[PDB]
């Protein structure tokens, strides 16, 4: 049942703000945690105080108090208990080794303790949803440390990732390829499912569809929170598809190392003609401009495809659109896959932030497809990694913070193997 | 990573440091009485970095050091001299005689314990010490000698914190002594192994700018320190105003320093305004970009055409089209790709701040880790060897305890630094 | 000028340290009452902490020649010396950035150790230094600690288990230190502990708590060691061994 969400670093914390804000809007929960409905499925993400207060099962972690301070000051200061908002004083300075070895080890016992509190307030804990960035020191270093410790303590339960793939348009660090490779290596054997979010894809979708010349983090986070809501809606509402975290692996993970699905959301309409049909929003899920990780699935082979509809959606209209797309596009499945689409429907309308940048839609869909073309994102990281590491540039920062230089080679060898594993399953 | 402890040492250190505090206290709306008389709230958003409280107003987190009490009084008699903490003035009354050895080994070591006590005092009132900041001159005696000693002393007492320096370079065009190559060589030998980042402020460049650009026939130190205080205000913009990119000292050093010994930066900025009131050029974004990457605006006598940029940090100030900034910053890169290192993707980083410096509406500060900076060390190494071959003036350093081998090592390590800057200037992507 | 060894000006202090270094090399061996630097060891304990790095180096080389001068019977008063001298030697001699100032301080710690009866009353004093802010200090005195075990070894020490456990306590912390040199010099200290005992012991007690990449390095380091499982001889003898 219950699911504990963990938000690490600025990206993880700031996105968790946009997600939990949207969660409360969808479930009718007010900032003070009160709900007007006398006489569940959403209790998997919220707990209930004896006084009728609904508190998120979330933990916010950062090595710097600046971001989380805004949380315990803004609109949702009363929503969370202050024991769930953990901060340090010195951050990781975009350094994985600081977040994982030097600074992060001085707060790891404190974070696991506050998590055990939430885990002990649950009867049937499903697992964890980790929100973090690839480029930051805390989002890469400390997260991989926490993932190592959760596999030891809560070994039986599942762990899902919502990682923020870096992009130079909003990149705040040069060594972000280093941190991305390092965290992906040490977290690969601990993560059951990882949903990458290319900041460049969200950045361009905001520019193209919302007509925002220069998207802020608030624009990106509100668009991301829309997708994360569509993925977790199956856990917060009683449905048929993806009713627990173990079902995400069953439907999208054919092999333990190939646990990186590709999410495609539609429609994304600015708040300024008429409603889109089921066939039109289903067609948009196969346009790479609507993906959240820049890559071309036409240059890869599929292993899974799940359509998570929500809104005014009728099943016969879905199968009509699917049959059209399956015989009007090029969806290559591997010759050992069930080749069948999975469809989940949630008749609640897609909720947006009031006064926000996204318009309310009658219906929407989020497609979760596990394609080999997502390995192109690993190639773009492995290349930037190789250019700098061939000169050992910026390596002294990591070695000076408890990292042995050979761990760079190990992490790159794993990403080399991961690219081979995607090539093999591809053909 | 919040509060920054500022230190100024020697004659030049206290000169450019006092001018720097005048500039930022105005930008943060602080009058010499210490009170806040500003308008915007961004000026107080990150005022805790450089200032303290008195709860009765804001006080700078600065320590003033010199072996000569002459500059002590010219600072207190200045317009903002009454705002500094009285106890933070640590001054001996002997002097250094423009000798690096006197400041580093003899009479500066017998005063450095008094400074570390004031350093310790300002560090306890810090919720989380970010790093240190030093202004000094490498060609002198106190700022060069005692400054590098203060750096090494802070290094062994604060091995967690970033050590940042604003070191100015000696030049025969504005020189006070002949042993300046000796002092600068001995000082560079320390900065290359003790400081996490160092902004090279070449006086030969500052002189050439005042003479050939501002068209001043006889430049004074005030004419040179105007360019310094402007350059210092720009490279510290992201530290005291709420920005996202290069917010603290370490994050800047992690983006700018690919190799530990190559932490010597070539600062520049635009537009180049004289000590007059104000200009009416009102520069556009394409102009601020062309002026930034131009050698005529570099605070270091090095031609960027002679070397490649390892890393770059650009800072724009004033209300402007951030979209128009990206188009220009991307343009200069893909139009001059030969002068940017390929094996470091996205090495150039651009930040924007809405608040301009007082007097202008649009400005832009450049920070470059270029391999052309080897020309500056080549220049100093030339003058050093010219005297050291005959061991001229060496008795003043040996008379203060220094062995002759220390000169050979400092000279050798400087030439190693030059060869390494040339080493990565020749490395390719292939 | 014997009292100018604590004069204000450095050059006068530097001169007295050189004059002392001559006295200890040019005096009697039976010794003058003027060589009363045993019974007041706070004198040289003050010279080692000279505020002038140049004269501080000369106070240490003078302390070194004094320290080998006292290798003349009957000076069992070496117990009072180690307590008063090797904490100043460790805190500001091994921590020093000067390669010569540090090289002689390590040489004085060696002499003060062989003046003892075992290595324990020397390890216990520099063990607190393993938890210092300055990594260069803990980088240097873990190398020293490793070289007082390589040459002297665990013999005639009261309870070795209390001493083995005391020196094996910080080793997991030291091998995860942020500094590259602190880690590197701890891997060398583990090899010295490995050379005196077996491999079975410190796998039971230590090696399991290290990074797998680290305990692979130690395995490679153990292969490159050719000598017998324990060294059949001490590379350096104590003073009481070279006598009887
Ligand atoms: N979409 C989105 N991305 C973000 C946001 N905040 C940070 N990022 C991304 O995160 C990466 C930088 O890591 P951060 O999360 O900022 O750093 P951190 O996790 O706080 O760890 P530190 O280095 O110690 O500060 C960059 O690539 C950013 O694009 C956000 O609010 N929204
Ligand atoms: N730009 C600038 N350079 C200075 C100033 N004062 C001294 N210098 C330079 O510093 C060197 C002399 O060092 P100085 O600071 O006067 O001696 P110190 O007090 O012992 O450090 C000379 O090369 C001068 O060019 C100043 O106010 N501005
Ligand atoms: Mg952060
Ligand atoms: Mg002068």
PDB file of C-alpha atoms in Angstrom, chain B residues 5-219:
ATOM      1  CA  UNK B   5      36.018  36.396   5.327  1.00  0.00           C
ATOM      2  CA  UNK B   6      37.852  39.214   3.545  1.00  0.00           C
ATOM      3  CA  UNK B   7      41.525  40.050   4.126  1.00  0.00           C
ATOM      4  CA  UNK B   8      43.673  42.865   2.729  1.00  0.00           C
ATOM      5  CA  UNK B   9      47.446  42.895   3.213  1.00  0.00           C
ATOM      6  CA  UNK B  10      50.134  45.438   2.417  1.00  0.00           C
ATOM      7  CA  UNK B  11      49.952  48.813   0.738  1.00  0.00           C
ATOM      8  CA  UNK B  12      48.207  47.733  -2.473  1.00  0.00           C
ATOM      9  CA  UNK B  13      46.066  45.205  -0.604  1.00  0.00           C
ATOM     10  CA  UNK B  14      44.514  47.837   1.654  1.00  0.00           C
ATOM     11  CA  UNK B  15      44.246  50.319  -1.240  1.00  0.00           C
ATOM     12  CA  UNK B  16      42.251  48.160  -3.659  1.00  0.00           C
ATOM     13  CA  UNK B  17      40.461  46.521  -0.733  1.00  0.00           C
ATOM     14  CA  UNK B  18      39.151  49.807   0.655  1.00  0.00           C
ATOM     15  CA  UNK B  19      38.050  50.875  -2.829  1.00  0.00           C
ATOM     16  CA  UNK B  20      36.330  47.498  -3.228  1.00  0.00           C
ATOM     17  CA  UNK B  21      34.396  47.934   0.021  1.00  0.00           C
ATOM     18  CA  UNK B  22      33.351  51.432  -1.068  1.00  0.00           C
ATOM     19  CA  UNK B  23      31.930  50.008  -4.298  1.00  0.00           C
ATOM     20  CA  UNK B  24      29.938  47.102  -2.875  1.00  0.00           C
ATOM     21  CA  UNK B  25      28.710  49.007   0.199  1.00  0.00           C
ATOM     22  CA  UNK B  26      27.096  51.471  -2.201  1.00  0.00           C
ATOM     23  CA  UNK B  27      25.645  48.727  -4.409  1.00  0.00           C
ATOM     24  CA  UNK B  28      24.206  47.125  -1.259  1.00  0.00           C
ATOM     25  CA  UNK B  29      22.896  50.513  -0.081  1.00  0.00           C
ATOM     26  CA  UNK B  30      25.233  50.907   2.919  1.00  0.00           C
ATOM     27  CA  UNK B  31      26.407  54.379   3.932  1.00  0.00           C
ATOM     28  CA  UNK B  32      29.705  54.915   5.809  1.00  0.00           C
ATOM     29  CA  UNK B  33      27.712  54.958   9.060  1.00  0.00           C
ATOM     30  CA  UNK B  34      26.913  51.303   8.306  1.00  0.00           C
ATOM     31  CA  UNK B  35      23.168  51.884   7.957  1.00  0.00           C
ATOM     32  CA  UNK B  36      21.119  50.493   5.077  1.00  0.00           C
ATOM     33  CA  UNK B  37      19.614  53.243   2.895  1.00  0.00           C
ATOM     34  CA  UNK B  38      18.851  51.182  -0.215  1.00  0.00           C
ATOM     35  CA  UNK B  39      15.601  50.469  -2.025  1.00  0.00           C
ATOM     36  CA  UNK B  40      15.537  46.935  -3.460  1.00  0.00           C
ATOM     37  CA  UNK B  41      15.427  43.843  -1.263  1.00  0.00           C
ATOM     38  CA  UNK B  42      17.904  41.910  -3.420  1.00  0.00           C
ATOM     39  CA  UNK B  43      20.626  44.023  -1.801  1.00  0.00           C
ATOM     40  CA  UNK B  44      19.795  42.454   1.578  1.00  0.00           C
ATOM     41  CA  UNK B  45      18.984  38.949   0.307  1.00  0.00           C
ATOM     42  CA  UNK B  46      22.635  37.840   0.520  1.00  0.00           C
ATOM     43  CA  UNK B  47      24.209  40.604   2.601  1.00  0.00           C
ATOM     44  CA  UNK B  48      25.371  38.045   5.197  1.00  0.00           C
ATOM     45  CA  UNK B  49      28.195  36.993   2.855  1.00  0.00           C
ATOM     46  CA  UNK B  50      30.412  40.061   3.261  1.00  0.00           C
ATOM     47  CA  UNK B  51      28.829  41.877   6.226  1.00  0.00           C
ATOM     48  CA  UNK B  52      27.762  41.168   9.804  1.00  0.00           C
ATOM     49  CA  UNK B  53      25.114  42.614  12.104  1.00  0.00           C
ATOM     50  CA  UNK B  54      25.330  44.862  15.130  1.00  0.00           C
ATOM     51  CA  UNK B  55      22.029  43.958  16.838  1.00  0.00           C
ATOM     52  CA  UNK B  56      23.588  49.113  15.309  1.00  0.00           C
ATOM     53  CA  UNK B  57      23.921  48.329  11.599  1.00  0.00           C
ATOM     54  CA  UNK B  58      25.919  46.311   9.051  1.00  0.00           C
ATOM     55  CA  UNK B  59      29.676  45.880   9.487  1.00  0.00           C
ATOM     56  CA  UNK B  60      32.094  44.449   6.883  1.00  0.00           C
ATOM     57  CA  UNK B  61      33.693  41.059   7.519  1.00  0.00           C
ATOM     58  CA  UNK B  62      37.135  42.364   6.616  1.00  0.00           C
ATOM     59  CA  UNK B  63      40.564  42.222   8.249  1.00  0.00           C
ATOM     60  CA  UNK B  64      43.185  44.865   7.445  1.00  0.00           C
ATOM     61  CA  UNK B  65      46.853  43.873   7.744  1.00  0.00           C
ATOM     62  CA  UNK B  66      50.112  45.753   7.131  1.00  0.00           C
ATOM     63  CA  UNK B  67      53.610  45.871   8.631  1.00  0.00           C
ATOM     64  CA  UNK B  68      53.497  49.663   8.167  1.00  0.00           C
ATOM     65  CA  UNK B  69      50.894  51.832   9.979  1.00  0.00           C
ATOM     66  CA  UNK B  70      50.891  54.382   7.152  1.00  0.00           C
ATOM     67  CA  UNK B  71      48.125  52.800   5.093  1.00  0.00           C
ATOM     68  CA  UNK B  72      46.176  52.084   8.296  1.00  0.00           C
ATOM     69  CA  UNK B  73      45.449  55.786   8.820  1.00  0.00           C
ATOM     70  CA  UNK B  74      44.862  56.651   5.157  1.00  0.00           C
ATOM     71  CA  UNK B  75      42.140  53.977   5.178  1.00  0.00           C
ATOM     72  CA  UNK B  76      40.459  55.143   8.387  1.00  0.00           C
ATOM     73  CA  UNK B  77      40.656  58.723   7.092  1.00  0.00           C
ATOM     74  CA  UNK B  78      38.945  57.573   3.896  1.00  0.00           C
ATOM     75  CA  UNK B  79      35.233  58.011   3.223  1.00  0.00           C
ATOM     76  CA  UNK B  80      34.309  54.504   4.439  1.00  0.00           C
ATOM     77  CA  UNK B  81      37.093  54.186   7.019  1.00  0.00           C
ATOM     78  CA  UNK B  82      34.717  54.528   9.976  1.00  0.00           C
ATOM     79  CA  UNK B  83      32.714  51.393   9.092  1.00  0.00           C
ATOM     80  CA  UNK B  84      35.452  48.788   9.622  1.00  0.00           C
ATOM     81  CA  UNK B  85      35.805  47.086  12.991  1.00  0.00           C
ATOM     82  CA  UNK B  86      38.510  48.812  15.086  1.00  0.00           C
ATOM     83  CA  UNK B  87      39.823  45.499  16.435  1.00  0.00           C
ATOM     84  CA  UNK B  88      40.137  44.123  12.883  1.00  0.00           C
ATOM     85  CA  UNK B  89      43.047  46.483  12.119  1.00  0.00           C
ATOM     86  CA  UNK B  90      46.209  44.445  12.736  1.00  0.00           C
ATOM     87  CA  UNK B  91      49.278  46.558  12.020  1.00  0.00           C
ATOM     88  CA  UNK B  92      52.917  46.373  12.951  1.00  0.00           C
ATOM     89  CA  UNK B  93      55.069  49.488  12.966  1.00  0.00           C
ATOM     90  CA  UNK B  94      58.331  48.148  11.465  1.00  0.00           C
ATOM     91  CA  UNK B  95      57.845  47.655   7.725  1.00  0.00           C
ATOM     92  CA  UNK B  96      58.872  45.248   4.998  1.00  0.00           C
ATOM     93  CA  UNK B  97      61.091  47.365   2.725  1.00  0.00           C
ATOM     94  CA  UNK B  98      59.475  45.752  -0.333  1.00  0.00           C
ATOM     95  CA  UNK B  99      61.104  42.457   0.683  1.00  0.00           C
ATOM     96  CA  UNK B 100      59.125  39.237   0.310  1.00  0.00           C
ATOM     97  CA  UNK B 101      61.404  37.504   2.825  1.00  0.00           C
ATOM     98  CA  UNK B 102      60.848  40.170   5.491  1.00  0.00           C
ATOM     99  CA  UNK B 103      57.085  39.742   5.203  1.00  0.00           C
ATOM    100  CA  UNK B 104      57.055  35.960   4.827  1.00  0.00           C
ATOM    101  CA  UNK B 105      59.869  34.841   7.164  1.00  0.00           C
ATOM    102  CA  UNK B 106      61.101  37.581   9.493  1.00  0.00           C
ATOM    103  CA  UNK B 107      58.847  40.433  10.628  1.00  0.00           C
ATOM    104  CA  UNK B 108      55.612  39.168   9.089  1.00  0.00           C
ATOM    105  CA  UNK B 109      55.840  35.862  10.948  1.00  0.00           C
ATOM    106  CA  UNK B 110      56.137  37.780  14.231  1.00  0.00           C
ATOM    107  CA  UNK B 111      52.847  39.538  13.378  1.00  0.00           C
ATOM    108  CA  UNK B 112      50.867  36.735  11.705  1.00  0.00           C
ATOM    109  CA  UNK B 113      49.730  35.285  15.043  1.00  0.00           C
ATOM    110  CA  UNK B 114      47.948  38.574  15.767  1.00  0.00           C
ATOM    111  CA  UNK B 115      46.095  38.290  12.454  1.00  0.00           C
ATOM    112  CA  UNK B 116      45.004  34.675  12.952  1.00  0.00           C
ATOM    113  CA  UNK B 117      43.417  35.766  16.237  1.00  0.00           C
ATOM    114  CA  UNK B 118      41.252  38.252  14.329  1.00  0.00           C
ATOM    115  CA  UNK B 119      40.680  35.620  11.631  1.00  0.00           C
ATOM    116  CA  UNK B 120      39.537  33.174  14.313  1.00  0.00           C
ATOM    117  CA  UNK B 121      37.245  35.818  15.816  1.00  0.00           C
ATOM    118  CA  UNK B 122      35.394  36.549  12.566  1.00  0.00           C
ATOM    119  CA  UNK B 123      35.153  32.812  11.803  1.00  0.00           C
ATOM    120  CA  UNK B 124      33.297  31.964  15.034  1.00  0.00           C
ATOM    121  CA  UNK B 125      30.450  34.392  14.231  1.00  0.00           C
ATOM    122  CA  UNK B 126      29.953  32.480  10.948  1.00  0.00           C
ATOM    123  CA  UNK B 127      27.072  30.005  10.728  1.00  0.00           C
ATOM    124  CA  UNK B 128      28.949  28.225   7.924  1.00  0.00           C
ATOM    125  CA  UNK B 129      32.228  29.699   6.682  1.00  0.00           C
ATOM    126  CA  UNK B 130      32.350  29.641   2.880  1.00  0.00           C
ATOM    127  CA  UNK B 131      35.938  30.717   2.272  1.00  0.00           C
ATOM    128  CA  UNK B 132      38.536  33.463   2.409  1.00  0.00           C
ATOM    129  CA  UNK B 133      39.366  36.371   0.108  1.00  0.00           C
ATOM    130  CA  UNK B 134      42.749  38.113  -0.060  1.00  0.00           C
ATOM    131  CA  UNK B 135      43.798  41.303  -1.844  1.00  0.00           C
ATOM    132  CA  UNK B 136      47.530  41.982  -2.141  1.00  0.00           C
ATOM    133  CA  UNK B 137      50.397  42.752  -4.522  1.00  0.00           C
ATOM    134  CA  UNK B 138      52.895  40.086  -5.556  1.00  0.00           C
ATOM    135  CA  UNK B 139      55.678  42.589  -6.256  1.00  0.00           C
ATOM    136  CA  UNK B 140      55.777  44.112  -2.777  1.00  0.00           C
ATOM    137  CA  UNK B 141      56.980  42.992   0.620  1.00  0.00           C
ATOM    138  CA  UNK B 142      54.017  42.810   2.990  1.00  0.00           C
ATOM    139  CA  UNK B 143      51.190  41.788   0.668  1.00  0.00           C
ATOM    140  CA  UNK B 144      53.500  39.392  -1.160  1.00  0.00           C
ATOM    141  CA  UNK B 145      55.507  37.944   1.729  1.00  0.00           C
ATOM    142  CA  UNK B 146      53.112  38.125   4.661  1.00  0.00           C
ATOM    143  CA  UNK B 147      50.118  37.524   2.395  1.00  0.00           C
ATOM    144  CA  UNK B 148      51.363  34.155   1.163  1.00  0.00           C
ATOM    145  CA  UNK B 149      52.242  33.321   4.770  1.00  0.00           C
ATOM    146  CA  UNK B 150      48.700  34.220   5.838  1.00  0.00           C
ATOM    147  CA  UNK B 151      47.391  31.983   3.041  1.00  0.00           C
ATOM    148  CA  UNK B 152      49.513  29.039   4.166  1.00  0.00           C
ATOM    149  CA  UNK B 153      48.557  29.685   7.795  1.00  0.00           C
ATOM    150  CA  UNK B 154      44.838  29.843   6.993  1.00  0.00           C
ATOM    151  CA  UNK B 155      45.337  26.732   4.842  1.00  0.00           C
ATOM    152  CA  UNK B 156      46.561  24.702   7.824  1.00  0.00           C
ATOM    153  CA  UNK B 157      43.890  26.061  10.194  1.00  0.00           C
ATOM    154  CA  UNK B 158      40.978  26.010   7.699  1.00  0.00           C
ATOM    155  CA  UNK B 159      41.677  23.101   5.318  1.00  0.00           C
ATOM    156  CA  UNK B 160      37.939  22.898   4.555  1.00  0.00           C
ATOM    157  CA  UNK B 161      37.482  26.439   3.249  1.00  0.00           C
ATOM    158  CA  UNK B 162      38.181  27.916  -0.181  1.00  0.00           C
ATOM    159  CA  UNK B 163      41.187  30.239  -0.472  1.00  0.00           C
ATOM    160  CA  UNK B 164      40.573  32.959  -3.078  1.00  0.00           C
ATOM    161  CA  UNK B 165      42.982  35.800  -3.865  1.00  0.00           C
ATOM    162  CA  UNK B 166      43.045  39.055  -5.833  1.00  0.00           C
ATOM    163  CA  UNK B 167      46.758  39.348  -6.621  1.00  0.00           C
ATOM    164  CA  UNK B 168      48.066  42.250  -8.704  1.00  0.00           C
ATOM    165  CA  UNK B 169      51.120  41.787 -10.915  1.00  0.00           C
ATOM    166  CA  UNK B 170      54.186  44.075 -10.908  1.00  0.00           C
ATOM    167  CA  UNK B 171      55.285  45.800 -14.105  1.00  0.00           C
ATOM    168  CA  UNK B 172      58.158  48.137 -15.068  1.00  0.00           C
ATOM    169  CA  UNK B 173      55.581  50.610 -16.400  1.00  0.00           C
ATOM    170  CA  UNK B 174      54.317  51.179 -12.839  1.00  0.00           C
ATOM    171  CA  UNK B 175      57.102  49.757 -10.664  1.00  0.00           C
ATOM    172  CA  UNK B 176      58.380  50.903  -7.277  1.00  0.00           C
ATOM    173  CA  UNK B 177      61.405  48.596  -6.933  1.00  0.00           C
ATOM    174  CA  UNK B 178      63.726  46.354  -8.932  1.00  0.00           C
ATOM    175  CA  UNK B 179      63.207  43.252  -6.745  1.00  0.00           C
ATOM    176  CA  UNK B 180      59.566  42.982  -7.803  1.00  0.00           C
ATOM    177  CA  UNK B 181      60.320  39.987 -10.102  1.00  0.00           C
ATOM    178  CA  UNK B 182      61.897  38.282  -7.086  1.00  0.00           C
ATOM    179  CA  UNK B 183      58.869  38.964  -4.886  1.00  0.00           C
ATOM    180  CA  UNK B 184      56.356  38.037  -7.599  1.00  0.00           C
ATOM    181  CA  UNK B 185      58.186  34.800  -8.449  1.00  0.00           C
ATOM    182  CA  UNK B 186      58.395  33.779  -4.793  1.00  0.00           C
ATOM    183  CA  UNK B 187      54.722  34.689  -4.385  1.00  0.00           C
ATOM    184  CA  UNK B 188      53.453  32.869  -7.494  1.00  0.00           C
ATOM    185  CA  UNK B 189      55.365  29.837  -6.209  1.00  0.00           C
ATOM    186  CA  UNK B 190      53.040  29.987  -3.180  1.00  0.00           C
ATOM    187  CA  UNK B 191      49.737  30.788  -4.914  1.00  0.00           C
ATOM    188  CA  UNK B 192      50.103  27.844  -7.310  1.00  0.00           C
ATOM    189  CA  UNK B 193      50.129  25.442  -4.334  1.00  0.00           C
ATOM    190  CA  UNK B 194      47.965  27.174  -1.704  1.00  0.00           C
ATOM    191  CA  UNK B 195      45.106  29.099  -3.330  1.00  0.00           C
ATOM    192  CA  UNK B 196      42.055  27.435  -4.860  1.00  0.00           C
ATOM    193  CA  UNK B 197      41.546  30.350  -7.267  1.00  0.00           C
ATOM    194  CA  UNK B 198      43.522  33.497  -8.084  1.00  0.00           C
ATOM    195  CA  UNK B 199      42.515  36.490 -10.216  1.00  0.00           C
ATOM    196  CA  UNK B 200      45.564  37.826 -12.058  1.00  0.00           C
ATOM    197  CA  UNK B 201      45.376  41.631 -12.032  1.00  0.00           C
ATOM    198  CA  UNK B 202      48.228  42.791 -14.262  1.00  0.00           C
ATOM    199  CA  UNK B 203      49.355  46.361 -13.614  1.00  0.00           C
ATOM    200  CA  UNK B 204      50.911  46.468 -17.090  1.00  0.00           C
ATOM    201  CA  UNK B 205      47.434  45.758 -18.461  1.00  0.00           C
ATOM    202  CA  UNK B 206      45.833  48.318 -16.135  1.00  0.00           C
ATOM    203  CA  UNK B 207      48.396  50.916 -17.213  1.00  0.00           C
ATOM    204  CA  UNK B 208      47.946  50.187 -20.925  1.00  0.00           C
ATOM    205  CA  UNK B 209      44.173  50.503 -20.480  1.00  0.00           C
ATOM    206  CA  UNK B 210      44.391  53.873 -18.730  1.00  0.00           C
ATOM    207  CA  UNK B 211      46.918  55.085 -21.318  1.00  0.00           C
ATOM    208  CA  UNK B 212      45.802  53.614 -24.653  1.00  0.00           C
ATOM    209  CA  UNK B 213      42.039  53.255 -24.022  1.00  0.00           C
ATOM    210  CA  UNK B 214      41.002  55.912 -21.486  1.00  0.00           C
ATOM    211  CA  UNK B 215      43.642  58.202 -23.078  1.00  0.00           C
ATOM    212  CA  UNK B 216      45.329  59.273 -19.836  1.00  0.00           C
ATOM    213  CA  UNK B 217      48.899  60.463 -20.347  1.00  0.00           C
ATOM    214  CA  UNK B 218      50.081  59.956 -16.736  1.00  0.00           C
ATOM    215  CA  UNK B 219      47.988  57.307 -14.946  1.00  0.00           C
TER     216      UNK B 219
END
